[PDB]
Amino acid sequence: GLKAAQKTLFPLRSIDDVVRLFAAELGREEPDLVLLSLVLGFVEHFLAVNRVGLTYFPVADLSIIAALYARFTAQIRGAVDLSLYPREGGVSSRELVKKVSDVIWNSLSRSYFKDRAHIQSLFSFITGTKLDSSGVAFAVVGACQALGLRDVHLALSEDHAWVVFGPNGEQTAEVTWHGKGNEDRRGQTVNAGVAERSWLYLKGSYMRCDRKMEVAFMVCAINPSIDLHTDSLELLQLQQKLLWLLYDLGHLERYPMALGNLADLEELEPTPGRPDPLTLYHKGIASAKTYYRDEHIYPYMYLARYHCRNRNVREALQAWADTATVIQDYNYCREDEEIYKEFFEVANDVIPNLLKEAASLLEAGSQGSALQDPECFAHLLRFYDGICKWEEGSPTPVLHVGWATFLVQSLGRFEGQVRQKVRIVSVGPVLTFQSEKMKGMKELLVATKINSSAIKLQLTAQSQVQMK
Amino acid sequence: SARWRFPARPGT
């Protein structure tokens, strides 16, 4: 069911031929999500899942891609009778969206591993009847487009995907599962999750995609991994070129994570004439501030990881502190465990290792060391403050004694003379705390000898010491 | 073996 203009670039014999197809689609009224995802999946299959016989690039012949396309459009159009679901005024109904969701869901293999690579695309859905969590939501949107439902669009948080539709684009529906061992909410709105102020629903500051942003999603969903050890250079290059295409057309303006992904790719292999990774990381942060009320975590995590890779201790600490300043205004809720795990690794592994190395380089006579900079100590404190404030009001606790040992260790990496230069001011470096835990910890933070037991008592729910 | 990750999540 492809239009004649959609077929004139085939066969696709190179990365650039793939890019030309994306450009042509992105120049149309609406880019064809089904065509583009099939093409990406096909190429990824033959560059990452099965490279046997690869010489340059897996040539995508029209007859193959068209046959796949027709399998998909036939499956959807035969299973969804639009006459059962009347459409007033270019608006879909919740029952129709539920129907499309159920058609995709009920098509999947009964039992398979959901965390496998390379099951994100409509190629995977057609050939293997397998999709990952977010891949289901994308497939529901692609099915909707195939049915002429122009109002149905992908919604994205930083760890989940669903659909928006309906009068004014205001209706939400769950269409896929989230995480492992969580209960399904398919068909429901996301309003309880917004109301709960969980990270998973971003307090309502989530991405509402247009069709061009849906193209960006599928590009970000490219997986170059061949195994844990090795990535496909061709798929990295394709992803990078497609991200620049979208960038230049304006389609990454409202997509912070995509700008961070692009930055990472640029660090690996810089494109002549293009912005530096740091510029792109800062663009991602600016997008979150501009469009999403500065309620996103990963723009700052992308930046912090860049600084941490480059052994920039000051700027790494600053960026994690900024991360924590975002999280502090959330409630930690049951399906937010991915961001918990990220903060836990930063506090209890990443920062300890950075400061350990800094302590060695300080012994070796580094000048300008983070460990002699009071502003760096302040960033460490602001990081913990944000985590403590996050916990306030939450249905799930965050902190425990396992966190306390690393806090005491990290505080200890700064000399008392450095720590004393931070002034902790109430509402040199000046710091205001937002959390009641850190407010109570203020006086302990400048002793020459850090009082480990006192700190542990202040950070945790523990209020007594051993009886004997 | 390679693993899924949420699209454009940072890190490895």
Author numbering:
A (entry chain A): 2 to 53, 74 to 386, 399 to 460, 548 to 588
B (entry chain B): 4 to 15
From the paper:
pmcMenin, a 67 kDa protein encoded by the MEN1 (Multiple Endocrine Neoplasia 1) gene, is a chromatin adaptor protein that interacts with MLL1 (Mixed Lineage Leukemia 1, also known as KMT2A) to regulate the expression of multiple genes, including HOXA cluster genes. Menin has been identified as an essential oncogenic co-factor of MLL1 fusion proteins found in acute leukemia patients. MBM1 binds to the central cavity of menin, utilizing Phe9, Pro10, and Pro13 as energetic hotspots, which occupy well-defined hydrophobic pockets, and positively charged arginine residues (Arg8 and Arg12) that are involved in electrostatic interactions with the negatively charged binding site on menin. Importantly, recent clinical studies found emerging resistance to Revumenib treatment and patient relapse as a result of somatic mutations in MEN1, leading to point mutations of T349M, M327I/V, and G331R/D. Understanding how these mutations affect menin structure as well as the interaction with MLL1 and current menin inhibitors will be crucial in the development of a new generation of inhibitors maintaining their activity against menin mutants.
On the contrary, mutations of G331 to arginine or aspartate perturb the charge in the MLL1 binding site on menin, resulting in decreased MBM1 binding affinity. The crystal structures of G331R and G331D revealed that both mutations do not show steric clashes with MBM1, and the side chains of R331 and D331 approach Gly14 from MBM1. The relatively short, 7 to 8 Å, distance between the guanidine groups of R331 in the G331R variant and Arg8 and Arg12 in MBM1 likely results in unfavorable electrostatic interactions, which could be partially compensated by favorable contacts with E368 and E371, leading to a modest, 3-fold reduction in the affinity to the G331R variant. We have also calculated the electrostatic potential for the wild-type, G331R, and G331D menin variants and found that in all cases the MBM1 site on menin has a strong negative charge that is minimally perturbed by either of the two G331 mutations. This analysis suggests that the electrostatic potential in menin is optimized to match the charge of the MBM1 motif in MLL1, and an introduction of either positive or negative charge distorts the charge complementarity between menin and MBM1, leading to a decrease in the binding affinity. However, reduced binding for G331 menin mutants was not observed for the longer MLL14-43 and MLL1160 constructs. This indicates that the presence of the second motif, MBM2, compensates for the partial loss of the MBM1 affinity towards G331 mutants. First, we tested competition with MLL1160 and found very similar IC50 values for wild-type menin and the three mutants M327I, T349M, and G331R, ranging between 4.1 and 8 nM. However, activity against menin mutants is significantly reduced, from 5-fold for G331R to over 100-fold for M327I.
